[PDB]
Amino acid sequence: DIPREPRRIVIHRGSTGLGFNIVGGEDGEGIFISFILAGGPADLSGELRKGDQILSVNGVDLRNASHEQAAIALKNAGQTVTIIAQYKPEEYSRFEANSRVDSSGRIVTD
Numbered sequence: 001d002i003p004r005e006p007r008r009i010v011i012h013r014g015s016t017g018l019g020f021n022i023v024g025g026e027d028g029e030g031i032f033i034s035f036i037l038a039g040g041p042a043d044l045s046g047e048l049r050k051g052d053q054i055l056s057v058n059g060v061d062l063r064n065a066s067h068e069q070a071a072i073a074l075k076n077a078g079q080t081v082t083i084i085a086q087y088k089p090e091e092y093s094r095f096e097a098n099s100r101v102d103s104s105g106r107i108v109t110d
Contacts, residue, residue, distance in 0.1 A: 002105050006055060006086040009047040013079050018042055022054065022074075023095050025067030030054075032092045033085070051092040051107050052085040 011018055019040020024032045033042075033052045042048045056062050057073045058081065065073070074081070089101045099109040 002049075002087050002089075004087055006084050007047065009045055009083045009085055011041045011045050011048075011081045011083065013041055013081060016041065018074060018081060019044070020048065022067065022070055023092075025065060025070055028064040030088075030091065031062055031065060031067065031070040032088070032095065034092075034096070048083070048085060049087065051087055051089040053088045053091070055084040055086055058082055 017037075017040065019037040020033050020042040021035040022031050023034040024030050031054045033048055033050055033054065036042045036048055036050060054062050054070065057070075058077045060073055062070055062073065089105060089107045093099045093101050093107055096107070096109060099107055102108050
């Protein structure tokens, strides 16, 4: 059972992206992590998953940004990036085609 309280996660950009993609951002639906690249900075933290909502970035409240503004925050957060994330797989699963949340709380995509 995957903890559902908010968490603080620090990522290190170095020489690449942060290593994840984001979806959502229409009409305050929120901004959700959709994909984490293996070996990437997000992956290297070990703390982020597909289905997390990004609540803030370097303390800037994101619960209601557009996708464009999430991406600018993220790009301009510099080298050490602090994220408050919270796992919301049911809300996430409505964004991904053919996806659902099993009884273990994991996102599955048929």
